[PDB]
Amino acid sequence: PEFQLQRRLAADIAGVGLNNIKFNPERLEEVEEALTREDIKKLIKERAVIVNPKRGISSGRLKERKHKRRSKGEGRKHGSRKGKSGARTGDKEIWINKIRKIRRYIRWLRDNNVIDKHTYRLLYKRAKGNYFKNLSDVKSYLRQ
Amino acid sequence: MKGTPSFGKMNKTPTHVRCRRCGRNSFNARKGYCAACGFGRSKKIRRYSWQNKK
Amino acid sequence: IAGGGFVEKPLLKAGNNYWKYRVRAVKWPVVRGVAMNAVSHPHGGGLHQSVSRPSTVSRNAPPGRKVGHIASRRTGRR
Amino acid sequence: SPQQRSGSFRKVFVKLPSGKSTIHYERRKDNIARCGMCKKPLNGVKNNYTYKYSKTEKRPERVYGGYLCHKCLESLI
């Protein structure tokens, strides 16, 4: 009266875990005489071998939450952060992005004749010198 | 530790295996010698005056 | 031969000393004997750490016993 | 079989329309073949983990083309 055979076999034929497999509480009599992988395959279509669909983590809440998180500054305040200052945001990365964006801007300015050579170099040296802080701030300086 | 764990690491290969001659799993691979069947450095069979108590 | 000023830079660290001889057969780190058990050193043993015998010995001294000041011409800092 | 170095830890799911994801092992890279006298980083010779029997394609048509550039070579002819 032990027939793990059927229970074990179904998991392989469906690629799911054993515990996620169920039989008909009725059709035990017509499932015992299964002896082959052929038989389990034939029986699964006949709905004797009911296969449990994979469940999942419902995620509607976090969809609302993240959207709540993102747009309106919800919970992001500095009074709710476990890590240290730079932990969330690597300042080195910011400087990398900062130094990058200003450079390619003035390149585009030179190759489009926005400014001259001597203007460029003085602008460039300042960038390495941390003279500016922002794309808007640096671009504002151009009109003096 | 000196107690049971000292026996723990003891799953590796036997430092004495089946020497082909005397049917005793007593061939020290590590020493390139059998301490039982004598094969390895004596052409003659290892035999002693005191195989037992006299 | 190159290597001038070789020892001017301090080792500053037993780690350096450890990797200075990592390949040379010098036994490292060197262990003094006067604190060792007498079972394995001529000057070993004793609660009060002291020089057991005048370290200077005669030239005919047997091997394994010649220790410390060996055939010293003179001692002292000066 | 124990976690080793012989094979770059690759997987398969980009160029892929069926549904199945697994792992593969593949041996390490080569470089331009070995020895050293001019220690010059060579060029223009093919070196793949398989060899397509391409005769000249793996060697320049220069006089010492597969051998080395003209930096350290005028000691022979």
């Binding site: - | - | 190159a2 290597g3 001038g4 000023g5 070789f6 001017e8 830079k9 500053l12 | -």
Partner: protein
């Protein structure tokens, strides 16, 4: 004291000061005897030096060219 402290407050300043003075001479800009002082030379190891222009390996001292 600059480079003298890159180990913190350890091992003794007097030791540090000795290690200090010699170290700068390694990093004090030198003059390549072969190409020129144009580029700077580096000390791969005691006696090993070449700048990145001459490509001329030569024998140096433990810490000086």
């Amino acid at each position: 004291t600059g480079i003298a402290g890159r180990f913190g407050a350890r091992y003794g300043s007097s030791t540090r000061k000795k290690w200090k003075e010699v170290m700068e001479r390694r990093y004090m800009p030198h003059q390549c005897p072969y190409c020129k002082t144009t580029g700077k030379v580096v000390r791969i190891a005691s006696g090993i030096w070449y700048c990145r222009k001459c490509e001329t390996k030569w024998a140096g001292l433990a810490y000086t060219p």
